DNA sequence: GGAAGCGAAAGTGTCGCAACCCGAGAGAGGAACGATCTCGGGTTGCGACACTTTCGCAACCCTTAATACGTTC
C-alpha cells in the first residue's frame, strides 16, 4: 500500500519485504532488501563493517529455573559473565542457545521449529504463576531496532496455556532465507561451545559422503555444545583433494566418455544404450553440481583452505602450520606444533580443544560468508563457556585478544573464572553473578574497578574476592607477626623478633621480597625509635 | 599397570607403549624407552622396570623388561593368599574424570 | 478458509555398543626357541532413538446487519 511504500522508502526492512512478497518495482524492493543485508564499509583498520549490525541486546528470565526475574543487558561486542555459582552461568547460556535455535531453524526451512522450554526442568519449582518465560530482544540496524522473541511454557493442568511468541524471529529469518534463494547473501553464524568441547579425538575419520560440502551443513549441530571437529577434518581433507584435482576435468573426461559411447551406439551396438543413458545422467549431474556451485557464488576450494589455515595459525599460538598428508593410502591432517610436525591426536588436550573451537568456527564462517573478502568478518553470535579451560596463564593473557582480532564482527558471550582473562577486558563488558542463598538474583552488576590493563593480583582481590596470599599457610602470616613483635619491643630486634627474622630469611631466602620488607621494617622502626628518644 | 596386573593374577600382563604415537617422530633410532626405579625399604632398594617399544615397520624389536615388577607383585599376591596383608593403592585421575 | 503456535504421525539418518578379527609381545614348557594368553587397534552389523517433514486444529468475520416480544431452520 502507499503506507508500506513510504516506510520502505524511509528504510524499513519489513515494509520493503512485504512489498516484495505482494508484487511477486518488485526488482526495486528486492534490491532494497538485499542492500540492507549486504551493504557495509571498510574502516580505517581495513576491517569490513556491516552498515546494519546484528546482536542480542537484552535477555529477561522469568520464573526460569532458580530465577524469579533476571534481566541482562549485553554488549554488542563482548560480554563476560563471572561468579562462583557456575550452574546459574550455564543456565544463562542455555536460555540464549534455545532462542538462537529459532533463527537457525527458519533460515534452513520455512516453518522450521527451534527448541522449546521443558515443563519439568525449566519452570521454577515454587513459581506462583506456574509458567516460565525467556524473553530476548535482538537488534538489526536502525531499520529494525527491536526484534523481540519470547519462549514460554506452562505447567500441566494450568487453566490457561502460555505460548511462545516467535513470529518476529521467523519473519527476520524468512528475509534471509528468501533473499538468499534468489541471490546469494552472507548469513549469520550462531554457535555454542560448552565444557563438552573437551572430548577425545577419533583418529579414524569418515569417507566423504558429500554432506559436508553443502553450505547449510554450517548450521548442523551448531548449538549442540561440542562443535563438530570431525566434520571439520572431513571437510578439510575434501578441500585438499579438490585442490590437487581439477574440477571440470571429470566433466571433460565424462564428456569424452559420453562422446565415445555415443559413437559406439551410432555404430550399431544397441546393447550399450542403457550404459550411455546412465553416463549421460552422470554428466548432467556433474554439470548441474558445477553450475549449482557456480550459481552459489562459493569461494574456490583453494581460497577456502587458505583462509581457514591462516585463522588457525593466527589464533592458536603453538600452531604455525596445518596441512593434509597422503601416507599409507589414507589422509592425515598434520600440524607444526611448537616447531615439530605432529598428528592432531598427538596434540596436548589444551591445544586440541582450542584448535577444535577455532577450526569449527572458521569452517562455518567460510561457508556462510562467501561474498566477503575476508569471510571471518561475517556477522554472528558465539557463546563460550569456561574460555580458560585447559589454558596456561600465558595463553589466558592472549586468548580474548586473538579471538576478537580473528572474528571482529562476532558478538561473544563468554564465562570465565580467570583474573588473567579479565585483565584484558573492559569493566563495562563484565557482569557479576552473585545470587542469594536461594540462587535468585535481579540484576548483574559491573565491577567498580577498571580491569583492562590492571594487575592480576588486584583483580583477584577486588573482583574475585580472593586473598593474593594463601591464608591457610602459616608462612603467609610471618611478616605480619614479625611487624607486631617489632612494635611491641619499641622497634628493637629482641630474641623473639630475631628468631622469626631468621625463619623468614631461612624460608623465603636472602633475595626474597619478604626479607626485603622485613629489612625495611627494621630500618624504619629503628629510625622512628631514635627520633622518639631524641624527643 | 604391571604391578596391578600381577597382584591380581600370576603372570598378568600390564599395558604397553603405542607404536603409532609414543615413539618420538624425529627419533633416528626408531624406538622408545620408559625406565622407572622403585624403592621398597632397605631390603629392596632398587626395583628397575623398563617399557620399550619399536616403531612400526622396524626390522628389530626392543623388548620391555618387566620381571622385577612381576617378582615384587608376586610377593604381595602370594603372601596375601596365605594371610591377609595391606596392599598398595595405584590410581590415575586424568582430565577425563570431568566427562559425564 | 485457515493466522500463529503447537504436536501427532510417520519416515530417515546417526551413532554407540557388542561381537568379532588381527598382529604384537612376554616368555611356559624345560634349557632352544617360542606355548598360551592378553594388549591395542580396526571392522561390521544392529537397533534405539534423534531428527525431519507433513498435516491439521480454527483466530479473524472482510466497506457492505438490525434492533416490539416469542418459536423454528
DSSP A450-484: --TT--HHHHHHHTS---SS-TT-GGGGHHHHHHH
> For residue A365, what is the DSSP state?
H
Q: How many C-beta atoms lie closer than 10 Å to residue A50's C-beta? A: 20
Which residues are CB-contacts of A435 (< 8 A; sequence separation ≥ 6)?
A66, A83, A85, A88, A441
d(C-alpha B67, C-alpha A305), whole Å: 52
Q: E strands within A155-307?
A: 189-193
Radius of gyration of chain A measured on its C-alpha atoms = 31
Does the distance separating the beta carbons of B25 and A340 come in below 8 Å? yes
Q: Which nucleotides of C are covered by protein (CB under 7 A)?
A: 4-7, 14-15, 24-28, 37-43, 51-55
Rounded to a whole number, what is the distance in Å from the CA of A24 to chain B's nearest CA? 52
Element spanning A86, H or E = helix A86-108
CA neighbor of A179 nearest in space, from A169, A171, A168? A171
CA neighbor of A321 nearest in space, from A341, A350, A344, A349? A341
Exposure string over B49-88, b if 16+ CB within 10 A, otherwise e:
bbbbbbbeeeeeebebebebbbebbeebbeeeeeeeeeee
Q: 3-state DSSP helix/strand/coil percent for chain A, to nearest 5?
A: 50, 20, 35
Which residues are CB-contacts of A314 (< 8 A; sequence separation ≥ 6)?
A402, A405, A406
Q: Which residues pair with A197 in a beta bridge?
A: none
d(C-alpha A315, C-alpha A232), whole Å: 17
Under a CB-based contact definition with an 8 Å cutoff, are residues B22 and B52 in contact? no
Under a CB-based contact definition with an 8 Å cutoff, are residues A296 and A370 in contact? yes
Does the distance separating the beta carbons of B98 and A198 come in below 8 Å? yes
d(C-alpha A406, C-alpha A231), whole Å: 21
CA neighbor of A56 nearest in space, from A97, A3, A5? A97
CA neighbor of A164 nearest in space, from A102, A88, A72, A103? A102
Of A198, A341, A346, the CB nearest to B21: A346
Nucleotide nearest to A117 (CA to C1'): C6
d(C-alpha A316, C-alpha A395), whole Å: 9
DSSP A199-217: ----SS-----SSTTSGGG
d(C-alpha A3, C-alpha A12), whole Å: 11
> For residue A298, what is the DSSP state?
P
Residue B96 approaches strand C within 7 Å at CB: no
Q: How far, in Å, are A4, A66, A72, A293 from residue A58 at the CA level?
A: 28, 19, 6, 39
Residue B54 approaches strand C within 7 Å at CB: yes
Pick the residue from chain A with its C-alpha nearest to B20: A346
Chain A residues in contact with B27 by the CB 8 A cut-off are none
CA neighbor of A91 nearest in space, from A101, A81, A79? A81
Among B17, B95, B97, most A C-beta atoms within 10 A, so best to mutate, is: B95
Residue B56 approaches strand C within 7 Å at CB: no
Rounded to a whole number, what is the distance in Å from the CA of A346 to chain B's nearest CA? 7
Nucleotide nearest to A171 (CA to C1'): C4
Does the distance separating the beta carbons of B95 and A349 come in below 8 Å? yes
d(C-alpha B91, C-alpha A417), whole Å: 29
Chain B residues in contact with A199 by the CB 8 A cut-off are 99
Does the distance separating the beta carbons of B26 and A340 come in below 8 Å? yes
Residue B66 approaches strand C within 7 Å at CB: yes
Q: Indicate the angle between helix axes A301-315 and A229-244, nearest 10 degrees.
A: 130
Nucleotide nearest to A116 (CA to C1'): C6
Rounded to a whole number, what is the distance in Å from the CA of B98 to chain A's nearest CA? 9
Does the distance separating the beta carbons of B95 and A390 come in below 8 Å? yes
Residue A177 approaches strand C within 7 Å at CB: no
Distance, Å, A160 CA → C73 C1': 36
Q: How many CB pairs under 8 A join A and B?
A: 16
Does the distance separating the beta carbons of A198 and B21 come in below 8 Å? no
CA neighbor of A215 nearest in space, from A262, A165, A176? A176
Under a CB-based contact definition with an 8 Å cutoff, are residues A388 and A357 in contact? no
Chain B residues in contact with A342 by the CB 8 A cut-off are 25
Residue A328 approaches strand C within 7 Å at CB: no
Does the distance separating the beta carbons of A342 and B25 come in below 8 Å? yes
The secondary structure of A146-163, three-state, reads EEEEEEEEECCCCCCCCC
DSSP A20-36: HHHH--HHHHHHHHHHH
Count Cβ atoms within 10 A of the Cβ of residue A349 and give its class: 0-12 exposed, 13-18 middle, 19 or more buried: middle
Residue B11 approaches strand C within 7 Å at CB: yes
Determination approach = cryo-EM
d(C-alpha A476, C-alpha A266), whole Å: 97
d(C-alpha B31, C-alpha B55), whole Å: 6
| Resolution for the entry shown, Å | 2.6
Distance, Å, B51 CA → C28 C1': 22
Distance, Å, A23 CA → C7 C1': 34
Distance, Å, A265 CA → C23 C1': 52
d(C-alpha A80, C-alpha A428), whole Å: 9
Of A200, A345, A349, the CB nearest to B21: A345
Amino acid at each position: 500500500t502507499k503506507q508500506y511504500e513510504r516506510k520502505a522508502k524511509g528504510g524499513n526492512l519489513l515494509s520493503a519485504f512485504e512489498l516484495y512478497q505482494r508484487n511477486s518495482l518488485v526488482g526495486e524492493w528486492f534490491e532494497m532488501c538485499r542492500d540492507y543485508i549486504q551493504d557495509g564499509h571498510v574502516d580505517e583498520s581495513g576491517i569490513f563493517r556491516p552498515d546494519n549490525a546484528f546482536y542480542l541486546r537484552r535477555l529477561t528470565l522469568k520464573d526460569f529455573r532458580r530465577f524469579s526475574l533476571l534481566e541482562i543487558k549485553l554488549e554488542e561486542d563482548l560480554t563476560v559473565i563471572i561468579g562462583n555459582n557456575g550452574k546459574g552461568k550455564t543456565s544463562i547460556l542455555y536460555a540464549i542457545a534455545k532462542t538462537l535455535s529459532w533463527f537457525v531453524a527458519n533460515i534452513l526451512k520455512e516453518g522450521g521449529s527451534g527448541q522449546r522450554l521443558s515443563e519439568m526442568t525449566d519452570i521454577k519449582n515454587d513459581a506462583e504463576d506456574r509458567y516460565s518465560d525467556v524473553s530476548s530482544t535482538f537488534f538489526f540496524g536502525k531499520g529494525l531496532k527491536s526484534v523481540p522473541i519470547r519462549l514460554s511454557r506452562s505447567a500441566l493442568g494450568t487453566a490457561e496455556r502460555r505460548d511462545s511468541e516467535v513470529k518476529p524471529a521467523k519473519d527476520l529469518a524468512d528475509i534471509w532465507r528468501v533473499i538468499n534463494e534468489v541471490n546469494t547473501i552472507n548469513l549469520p553464524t550462531f554457535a555454542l561451545y560448552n565444557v563438552e568441547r573437551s572430548q577425545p579425538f577419533n583418529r579414524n575419520i569418515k569417507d566423504n559422503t558429500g554432506r559436508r560440502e553443502e553450505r547449510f551443513d554450517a548450521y548442523s549441530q551448531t548449538l549442540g555444545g561440542a562443535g563438530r571437529f570431525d566434520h571439520f577434518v572431513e571437510w578439510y581433507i575434501y578441500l585438499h583433494k579438490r585442490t590437487v584435482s581439477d574440477i571440470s576435468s571429470s566433466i571433460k573426461e565424462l564428456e569424452q566418455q559420453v562422446n565415445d559411447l555415443q559413437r559406439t551406439v551410432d555404430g550399431g551396438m544397441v546393447s550399450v544404450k542403457s550404459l550411455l543413458e546412465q553416463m549421460k545422467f552422470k554428466l548432467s549431474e556433474a554439470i548441474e553440481r558445477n553450475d549449482a556451485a557456480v550459481s552459489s557464488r562459493v569461494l574456490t576450494e583453494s581460497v577456502q583452505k587458505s583462509i581457514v589455515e591462516k585463522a588457525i595459525c593466527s589464533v592458536v599460538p603453538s600452531i604455525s602450520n596445518i596441512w593434509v598428508e597422503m601416507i599409507t593410502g589414507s589422509d592425515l591432517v598434520k600440524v607444526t606444533n611448537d616447531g615439530h610436525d605432529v598428528t592432531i591426536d598427538q596434540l596436548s588436550d589444551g591445544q586440541r580443544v582450542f584448535l577444535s573451537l577455532v577450526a569449527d568456527l572458521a569452517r562455518r564462517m567460510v561457508m556462510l560468508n562467501p561474498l566477503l573478502e575476508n569471510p571471518l568478518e561475517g556477522r554472528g553470535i558465539v557463546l563460550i563457556d569456561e574460555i580458560e579451560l585447559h589454558l596456561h596463564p600465558k595463553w589466558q593473557q592472549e586468548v580474548i585478544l586473538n579471538l576478537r582480532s580473528a572474528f571482529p564482527n562476532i558478538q561473544f558471550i563468554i564465562t570465565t573464572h580467570s583474573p588473567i582473562v579479565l585483565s584484558t577486558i573492559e569493566k563495562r563488558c563484565i557482569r557479576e553473578f552473585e545470587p542469594n542463598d536461594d540462587g535468585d538474583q535481579s540484576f548483574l552488576d559491573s565491577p567498580d574497578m577498571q580491569t583492562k590493563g590492571s594487575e592480576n593480583a588486584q583483580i583477584l582481590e577486588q573482583v574475585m574476592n580472593v586473598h593474593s596470599t594463601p591464608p591457610g599457610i602459616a608462612e603467609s602470616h610471618w611478616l605480619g607477626n614479625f611487624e607486631l613483635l617489632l612494635l611491641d619491643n619499641s622497634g628493637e630486634l629482641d630474641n623473639h623478633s630475631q628468631v622469626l627474622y631468621d625463619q623468614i630469611k631461612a624460608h623465603f631466602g636472602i633475595d626474597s621480597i619478604e626479607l626485603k620488607k622485613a629489612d625495611s621494617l627494621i630500618r624504619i622502626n629503628k629510625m622512628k625509635n631514635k627520633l622518639n628518644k631524641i624527643r
